[PDB]
Amino acid sequence: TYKYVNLREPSMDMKSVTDRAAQTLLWTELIRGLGMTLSYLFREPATINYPFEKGPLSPRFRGEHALRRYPSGEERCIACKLCEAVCPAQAITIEAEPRADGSRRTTRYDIDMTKCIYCGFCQEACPVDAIVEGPNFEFSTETHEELLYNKEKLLNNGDKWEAEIAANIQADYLYR
Amino acid sequence: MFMINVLTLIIPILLAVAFLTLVERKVLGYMQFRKGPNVVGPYGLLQPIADAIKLFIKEPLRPATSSISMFILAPILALTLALTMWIPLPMPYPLINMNLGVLFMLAMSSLAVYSILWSGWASNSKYALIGALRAVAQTISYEVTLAIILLSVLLMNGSFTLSTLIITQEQVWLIFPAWPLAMMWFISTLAETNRAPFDLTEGEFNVEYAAGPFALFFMAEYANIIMMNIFTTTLFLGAFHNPYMPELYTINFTIKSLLLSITFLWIRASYPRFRYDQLMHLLWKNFLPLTLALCMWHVSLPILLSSIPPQT
Amino acid sequence: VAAFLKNVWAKEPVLVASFAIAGLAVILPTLSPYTKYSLMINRATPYNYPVPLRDDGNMPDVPSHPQDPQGPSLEWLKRL
Amino acid sequence: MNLMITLLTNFTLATLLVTIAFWLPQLNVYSEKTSPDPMGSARLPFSMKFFLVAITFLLFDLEIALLLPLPWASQTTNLNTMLTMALLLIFLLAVSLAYEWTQKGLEWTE
Amino acid sequence: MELLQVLKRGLQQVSGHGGLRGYLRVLFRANDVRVGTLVGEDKYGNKYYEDNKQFFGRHRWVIYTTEMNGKNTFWDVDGSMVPPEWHRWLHCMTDDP
Amino acid sequence: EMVRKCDPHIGLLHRGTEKLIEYKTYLQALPYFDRLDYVSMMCNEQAYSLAVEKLLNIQPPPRAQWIRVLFGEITRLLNHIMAVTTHALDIGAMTPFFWMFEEREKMFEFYERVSGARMHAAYVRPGGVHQDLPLGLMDDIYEFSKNFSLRIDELEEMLTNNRIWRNRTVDIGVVTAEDALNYGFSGVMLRGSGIQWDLRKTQPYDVYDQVEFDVPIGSRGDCYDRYLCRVEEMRQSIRIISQCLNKMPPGEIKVDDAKVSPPKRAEMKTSMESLIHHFKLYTEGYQVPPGATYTAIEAPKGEFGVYLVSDGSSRPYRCKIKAPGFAHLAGLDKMSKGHMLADVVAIIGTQDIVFGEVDR
Amino acid sequence: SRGEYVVAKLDDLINWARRSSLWPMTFGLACCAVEMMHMAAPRYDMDRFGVVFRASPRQSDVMIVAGTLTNKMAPALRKVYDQMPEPRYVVSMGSCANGGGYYHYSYSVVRGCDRIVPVDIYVPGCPPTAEALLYGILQLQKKIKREKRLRIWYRR
Amino acid sequence: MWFEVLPGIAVMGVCLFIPGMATARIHRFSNGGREKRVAHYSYQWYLMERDRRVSGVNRYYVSKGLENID
Numbered sequence A: 001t002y003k004y005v006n007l008r009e010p011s012m013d014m015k016s017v018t019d020r021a022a023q024t025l026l027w028t029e030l031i032r033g034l035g036m037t038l039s040y041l042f043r044e045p046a047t048i049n050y051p052f053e054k055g056p057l058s059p060r061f062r063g064e065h066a067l068r069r070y071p072s073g074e075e076r077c078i079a080c081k082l083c084e085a086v087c088p089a090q091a092i093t094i095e096a097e098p099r100a101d102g103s104r105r106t107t108r109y110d111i112d113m114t115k116c117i118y119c120g121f122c123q124e125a126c127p128v129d130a131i132v133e134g135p136n137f138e139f140s141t142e143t144h145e146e147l148l149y150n151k152e153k154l155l156n157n158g159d160k161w162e163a164e165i166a167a168n169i170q171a172d173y174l175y176r
Numbered sequence B: 001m002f003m004i005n006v007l008t009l010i011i012p013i014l015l016a017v018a019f020l021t022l023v024e025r026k027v028l029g030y031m032q033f034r035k036g037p038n039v040v041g042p043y044g045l046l047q048p049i050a051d052a053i054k055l056f057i058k059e060p061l062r063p064a065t066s067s068i069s070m071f072i073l074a075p076i077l078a079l080t081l082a083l084t085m086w087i088p089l090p091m092p093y094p095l096i097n098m099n100l101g102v103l104f105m106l107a108m109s110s111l112a113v114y115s116i117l118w119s120g121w122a123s124n125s126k127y128a129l130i131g132a133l134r135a136v137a138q139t140i141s142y143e144v145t146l147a148i149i150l151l152s153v154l155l156m157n158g159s160f161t162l163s164t165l166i167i168t169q170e171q172v173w174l175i176f177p178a179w180p181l182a183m184m185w186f187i188s189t190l191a192e193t194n195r196a197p198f199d200l201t202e203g204e205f206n207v208e209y210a211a212g213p214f215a216l217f218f219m220a221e222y223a224n225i226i227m228m229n230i231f232t233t234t235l236f237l238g239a240f241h242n243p244y245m246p247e248l249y250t251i252n253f254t255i256k257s258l259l260l261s262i263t264f265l266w267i268r269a270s271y272p273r274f275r276y277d278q279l280m281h282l283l284w285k286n287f288l289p290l291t292l293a294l295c296m297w298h299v300s301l302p303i304l305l306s307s308i309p310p311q312t
Numbered sequence C: 001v002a003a004f005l006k007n008v009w010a011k012e013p014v015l016v017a018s019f020a021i022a023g024l025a026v027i028l029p030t031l032s033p034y035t036k037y038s039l040m041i042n043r044a045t046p047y048n049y050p051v052p053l054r055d056d057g058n059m060p061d062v063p064s065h066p067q068d069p070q071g072p073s074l075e076w077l078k079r080l
Numbered sequence D: 001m002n003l004m005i006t007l008l009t010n011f012t013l014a015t016l017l018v019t020i021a022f023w024l025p026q027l028n029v030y031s032e033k034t035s036p037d038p039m040g041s042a043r044l045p046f047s048m049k050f051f052l053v054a055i056t057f058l059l060f061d062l063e064i065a066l067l068l069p070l071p072w073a074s075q076t077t078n079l080n081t082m083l084t085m086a087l088l089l090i091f092l093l094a095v096s097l098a099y100e101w102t103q104k105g106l107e108w109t110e
Numbered sequence E: 001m002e003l004l005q006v007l008k009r010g011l012q013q014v015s016g017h018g019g020l021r022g023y024l025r026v027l028f029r030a031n032d033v034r035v036g037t038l039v040g041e042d043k044y045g046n047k048y049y050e051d052n053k054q055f056f057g058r059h060r061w062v063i064y065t066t067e068m069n070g071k072n073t074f075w076d077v078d079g080s081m082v083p084p085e086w087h088r089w090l091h092c093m094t095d096d097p
Numbered sequence F: 001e002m003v004r005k006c007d008p009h010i011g012l013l014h015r016g017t018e019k020l021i022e023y024k025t026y027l028q029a030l031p032y033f034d035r036l037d038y039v040s041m042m043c044n045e046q047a048y049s050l051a052v053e054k055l056l057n058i059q060p061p062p063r064a065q066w067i068r069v070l071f072g073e074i075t076r077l078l079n080h081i082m083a084v085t086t087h088a089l090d091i092g093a094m095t096p097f098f099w100m101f102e103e104r105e106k107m108f109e110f111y112e113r114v115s116g117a118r119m120h121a122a123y124v125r126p127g128g129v130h131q132d133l134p135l136g137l138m139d140d141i142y143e144f145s146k147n148f149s150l151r152i153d154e155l156e157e158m159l160t161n162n163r164i165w166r167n168r169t170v171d172i173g174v175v176t177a178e179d180a181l182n183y184g185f186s187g188v189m190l191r192g193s194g195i196q197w198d199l200r201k202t203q204p205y206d207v208y209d210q211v212e213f214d215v216p217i218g219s220r221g222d223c224y225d226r227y228l229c230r231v232e233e234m235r236q237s238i239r240i241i242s243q244c245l246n247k248m249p250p251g252e253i254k255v256d257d258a259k260v261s262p263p264k265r266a267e268m269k270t271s272m273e274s275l276i277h278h279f280k281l282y283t284e285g286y287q288v289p290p291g292a293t294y295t296a297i298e299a300p301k302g303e304f305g306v307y308l309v310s311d312g313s314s315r316p317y318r319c320k321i322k323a324p325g326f327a328h329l330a331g332l333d334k335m336s337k338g339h340m341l342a343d344v345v346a347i348i349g350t351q352d353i354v355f356g357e358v359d360r
Numbered sequence G: 001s002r003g004e005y006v007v008a009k010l011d012d013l014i015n016w017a018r019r020s021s022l023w024p025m026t027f028g029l030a031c032c033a034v035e036m037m038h039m040a041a042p043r044y045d046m047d048r049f050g051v052v053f054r055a056s057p058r059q060s061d062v063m064i065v066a067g068t069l070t071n072k073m074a075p076a077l078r079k080v081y082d083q084m085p086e087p088r089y090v091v092s093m094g095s096c097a098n099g100g101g102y103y104h105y106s107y108s109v110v111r112g113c114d115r116i117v118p119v120d121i122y123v124p125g126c127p128p129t130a131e132a133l134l135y136g137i138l139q140l141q142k143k144i145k146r147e148k149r150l151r152i153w154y155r156r
Numbered sequence H: 001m002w003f004e005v006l007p008g009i010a011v012m013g014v015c016l017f018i019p020g021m022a023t024a025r026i027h028r029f030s031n032g033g034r035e036k037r038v039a040h041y042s043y044q045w046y047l048m049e050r051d052r053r054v055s056g057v058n059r060y061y062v063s064k065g066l067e068n069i070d
């Protein structure tokens, strides 16, 4: 249930002594190292051609956030603030009021993408699949406040990526 | 006309040093299961040009130098000695055909440590000075086995003439009578140019130089690398020379020197670094006793075989 | 002389190869039959001019022409 | 004469490249840099071992200077004397190395 | 000889990009000249290619359009130029284009 | 050249993690543990999960326990690749870094397939794992494991018999057994010094008594035996991963106590009790009965422990995090005496030190 | 004009050489260092873009702040930043370097590295992937591509 | 793959082929279509300066054979 690494007492017959001395004087293990490096010289490398080739992702991937809509145009967020109670970073700021037809809807849905730890507790705490953490990861900005999303930016990410987000949720929701 | 010959020596040295950096990054890339540079040029060929233009317009690092004069002279001396190590090299005819080209090269390579020493003292950092003293002691250490191995091999040549060393090897490569001298020579020239696994300047002296002069030290070091591979090629792997077609020798020694420079690139992507005492142990307690023993063997061996080479 | 030699070849083979190569370099020219030919080739290499002698009247072994039979010969150097 | 022209050309090319490296990026009008090391300000401690390996280099390089006429000395007619003195010089270099060994001179830079 | 098969694959890569002009076009825009089955094209001009004999990661790629939403993208290719319907397929979230 | 004293100054990544844990619930404080030993993410998840499940007096289902052991050994492969390749990269062997980070890249693809993030998964939770293994994942884990021994073999061909790698590691950083136990060392730091101790054998957790593996024991206490222990632990992790793939049971992946683990999303949208429990677990969180545990697991650096104090509420009252790297970097000063300055980078390498768990 | 064409072509030349030869000094602060080490790994391979792996901080062209910046190390970050030769750029990688992140309300964390150094590219994630960091590096290259140093110098 | 390093090696090999080819063609052009006279020793210099005097054009390489004797 255990083994002894490096507890080999070497042989002292003239065969093994001359083998070790030929290894010392003729550099056998150094040529073994050169052979392994030469072996990787003639291998096809593992380099994908980014941006033209992309690294493989799964439908569970947790990237850029997006507020979704029902298949009628109505937004799914019913202002229940579970995503900001569960948020380990307190990145989500929510303020709500009844809108002009009496629906429980948010007026403030902020996510600070520089507080966010991208762990997806908001999409798994959301009872109506409103906030999701979509598949976009290429959204680097040049300014800090461009990573401070309001409700307009998140609903635009939903409208921008819904054709992908709905298919990822369709592929994954029986594991959830 | 001779000035044209000096230009056709020294400008292609600079071009081959420029593209050796690309060959290093590519060969180290593919040996590391990745690619080297292939975006900046077609197959990466514009990477050294882009990098040279980048370094020459980067801000000067502006150090407080101890001596201004030696801070200027250390790149000057490094580049001048890096270029003058090529002029006795027979390929198949040298620029300066001299009777003592071997001893000239050993002398001008012995002078190369002053650039390291002056760059180390001309910086105000004591850490850079300690690193320079370590690098100078390393280089002057391995120059001992350079001199003695080189003498022992030239006991089969008859002279210090580098052009005679091609005539010496018309029946056999000189690595076949002298492969232990060849392998200790090869590791010793690997330790001359502060090259891995002997690069303790990268393991935790010219760090106070700006991007321009540091690039000049870097290109002088790679000119020394290409030159010592060409000198090892002429010294142990002497090609066939047809006097009516010299380009046969030129193509042949070029292929052998490229393989030997790639062998430097292939050593540096294969081994970890020595500790400083470990390569001191490698010189003084391993290479130098065998070097002295083989020097006795190559003194006494042309006498016991009646194979003393001609003086002329 | 037997266990000591295997011990030093097991621990320090670089030094054993050093003293072995140096010992062969010392002893082997005294035992080689070709050591004499090194001497005989080095003394037969004419760096200077063979300044001729005045024929006084009695020198039977000195030639008058280089292609004469008498004199030093180097057929051993051509044949070996 | 060709060699002096070659040395002057190499020194002139090196000085031209060094002048371009020290004066072309000086024309950048970037910014003045306010307030431009493992040891802070302590003096450099003298290492006895670095001086020892330098003097050992110097002495063995002198023994190399004695060994350098050997490709010419093999051409002599007094070959027994020449061979004896050549093996004696390389043997005295080896005795210098063995004494440097056994009196702990090759230590911590072995 | 199998070296001649290698040279024939290189020459049919030169042939398969529509000649030397298209070969150099994909060489300087893509740093890659290997030919692939055109899986599709979006409403911008991004051409999406397969080669299932390449290894996983190389087996799908995009040659980006030279103009998208008014910006000349002949040299300024961008990873965010992929529309979301091809972003599943190219990132291998599914097998289906 | 010698080293007379080594004073490591740390706190350069002290973020006050375990004070931030005191103001967040147990689920909310779970992703702080991914960020401590940031190359051993799911192992620290498992240690915190076992601490909370010990205080909650509940247990994971068997399939969740086998998933935790499978991904703990994948995590151990990740961490020992990081250990060996950066310890070689600092000495100068820079090439097996690039050779093994493709294998490490493929294991991050495994993490991303199973959780959605490549590093900080938040996948092993108190109660089980968050989500079940997607289809075709275990087949690809088998396809990884079928090839990975050859990668270890060519790593070991580049380093182990190399005389330069031996000279930098064989006489370097010798730790005796009594001073290893006295400095609070754990893992390979003990096992390189001859000490036959492994927490997966002695104080076993989830299903480690049902896997068969060996424990590599060094003989000299140096950098080289600890290197050989880490390489052989990659071998034995491949052995445990084969046993986990062959003995994976069917079933659920969370505990079926819906007052601890949240219900499925289909039944939360159908049942009243499930919606109430979903609400109260994702807003308040489950209450934990009051008590102090010290739950320690065998993380790939050593004994990773959590002294978790619950006051009876839905947030931790106290959560002390014992890291192996803290005691190892404390023992750095004894381990480097009489050595040279270039030996110290080998000694800092052979203690697998990641400063997130050192500093918290 | 003619000189406007000359400064346009010289801006194109020097911006080409500066974006095609970026040398990064990466602060390996925290978990984002692991993902930078994956952006140097064979799959993504920064070196094929001319982006070398671990240049020294006095010859580097861009400082990648990859991890959490604490109060104890913020003067060391500012020291390394001040010691960089110009043109120097700052990529902020990950949430803690961007805005404090998961340690934003901590007593010992600088709430974003932009309180310390001027930041050019903010790369979001925890950690952002090696592909996302490579996206940020290529966006930095595009930012260098549209620099107008000599055109504004000619128009001043 | 591994043949991607070969353009850089080809450029570097042409850059090493240039100096030897150039000095060979210059030694043929500057010496009357022949090799440069190697005069390492003073006898070789004596013969070379005798050639310079017997050519009549102040050039060592312009050779004079049996046409110069009667």
Ligand SMILES: CCCCCCCCCCCCCCCCCC(=O)OC[C@H](COP(=O)([O-])OCC[N+](C)(C)C)OC(=O)CCCCCCCCCCCCCCCCC
Binding pocket: A024, A025, A026, A027, A030, A031, A034, B175, B180, B182, B183, B184, B186, B187, B197, B232, B236, B267, B271, B282, B285, B286, B287, B290, C011, C012, C013, C014, C016, C017, C020, C021, F163
């Ligand atoms: C010119 C073309 C290339 C030439 C060949 C070189 C290419 C191969 C390069 C491989 C990569 C090398 C990377 C750097 C390695 C540096 C470390 C190293 O190798 O150290 C050297 C090692 C150092 O020893 P060591 O450290 O391995 O061993 C331990 C040593 N002690 C015990 C002292 C600690 O070995 C040598 O020094 C050997 C040098 C060459 C020996 C040549 C012997 C020839 C045979 C003589 C005769 C023997 C029989 C007896 C007499 C018989 C008479 C009939």
Ligand SMILES: CCCCCCCCCCCCCCCCCC(=O)OC[C@H](COP(=O)(O)OCCN)OC(=O)CCCCCCCCCCCCCCCCC
Binding pocket: B015, B041, B042, B045, B046, B049, E028, E074, H011, H014, H015
């Ligand atoms: C001894 C031999 C030594 C050899 C050393 C050099 C080896 C490599 C040689 C070069 C190989 C080919 C290089 C091609 C570079 C890329 C050129 C290119 O495509 O540039 C495009 C760019 C923009 O053009 P644009 O009109 O905008 O394109 C839009 C099209 N609708 O337009 C531009 O950028 C403008 C044009 C720039 C042209 C630069 C060409 C490269 C110069 C390199 C220096 C060496 C020259 C060769 C020396 C040896 C041969 C004499």
Ligand SMILES: CCCCCCCCCCCCCCCCCC(=O)OC[C@H](COP(=O)(O)OCCN)OC(=O)CCCCCCCCCCCCCCCCC
Binding pocket: B073, B076, B077, B080, B081, B084, B097, B098, B099, B100, B101, B104, B111, D001, D003, D004, D007, D011, H039, H040, H041
């Ligand atoms: C700090 C200052 C600046 C530092 C940077 C620059 C200086 C350092 C780098 C340059 C070093 C220059 C070395 C000059 C002499 C080299 C030795 C030499 O000339 O050897 C070659 C040759 C001997 O071969 P041989 O064949 O015998 O001669 C032909 C006759 N058969 O001999 C000949 O062919 C002889 C030819 C005629 C005599 C030539 C004399 C040259 C000028 C004097 C030396 C110049 C250097 C002075 C400063 C050196 C500083 C280290």
Ligand SMILES: CCCCCCCCCCCCCCCCCC(=O)OC[C@H](COP(=O)(O)OCCN)OC(=O)CCCCCCCCCCCCCCCCC
Binding pocket: B288, B289, B290, B292, B293, C008, C012, C015, C016, C017, C018, C019, C020, C021, C022, C023, C024, C026, D091, D094, D095, D097, D098, D101, D102
């Ligand atoms: C007569 C021939 C010419 C001799 C002079 C020329 C020599 C040429 C080579 C130059 C040698 C220079 C250096 C010599 C140093 C000798 C002292 C020495 O090294 O002793 C120490 C060594 C044990 O090494 P240690 O001190 O432990 O090193 C620390 C790392 N472990 O101790 C040892 O390893 C034991 C060394 C002594 C025994 C060696 C026996 C070799 C026998 C080979 C076969 C016979 C060859 C004929 C000549 C025999 C001469 C004794």
Ligand SMILES: CCCCCCCCCCCCCCCCCC(=O)OC[C@H](COP(=O)(O)OCCN)OC(=O)CCCCCCCCCCCCCCCCC
Binding pocket: B018, B039, B040, B046, B048, B049, B050, B052, B053, E028, E029, E030, E075, E076, E077, G005, G006, G009, G010, G012, G013, G016, G145
């Ligand atoms: C009077 C008017 C003229 C004034 C003086 C200027 C003289 C000519 C100077 C060189 C040419 C200037 C134009 C520079 C390029 C402008 C166009 C450009 O940026 O093209 C981009 C293209 C690559 O596109 P990229 O954005 O990199 O895309 C990423 C991959 N999709 O880029 C490419 O395809 C490659 C671009 C290469 C640039 C030219 C080659 C390098 C410079 C060579 C000459 C200078 C250096 C000489 C030797 C120095 C020492 C070795």
Ligand SMILES: CCCCCCCCCCC1=C(C)C(=O)C(OC)=C(OC)C1=O
Binding pocket: B014, B018, B021, B022, B047, B048, B051, B052, B055, B214, B215, B216, B218, B219
């Ligand atoms: C004008 C002639 C060339 C001048 C020298 C600049 C180009 C060669 C050196 C540049 C360089 C390259 C390419 C390089 O790749 C590199 O990284 C390994 C360097 O830094 C250590 C360099 O200095």
Ligand code: SF4
Binding pocket: A076, A077, A078, A079, A080, A081, A082, A083, A084, A094, A122, A125, A126, A127, A128, A129, A130, A131
């Ligand atoms: S996004 Fe979901 S969890 Fe958040 S307030 Fe809206 S409905 Fe509730």
Ligand code: SF4
Binding pocket: A083, A086, A087, A088, A089, A090, A091, A092, A111, A115, A116, A117, A118, A119, A120, A121, A122, A123, A133
């Ligand atoms: S992914 Fe996590 S940290 Fe980010 S907004 Fe959602 S719950 Fe908050």
Ligand code: SF4
Binding pocket: F035, F038, F120, G030, G031, G032, G033, G066, G067, G068, G093, G094, G095, G096, G097, G101, G102, G125, G126, G127, G128
């Ligand atoms: S942003 Fe997050 S994952 Fe990245 S270094 Fe910070 S704590 Fe680690």
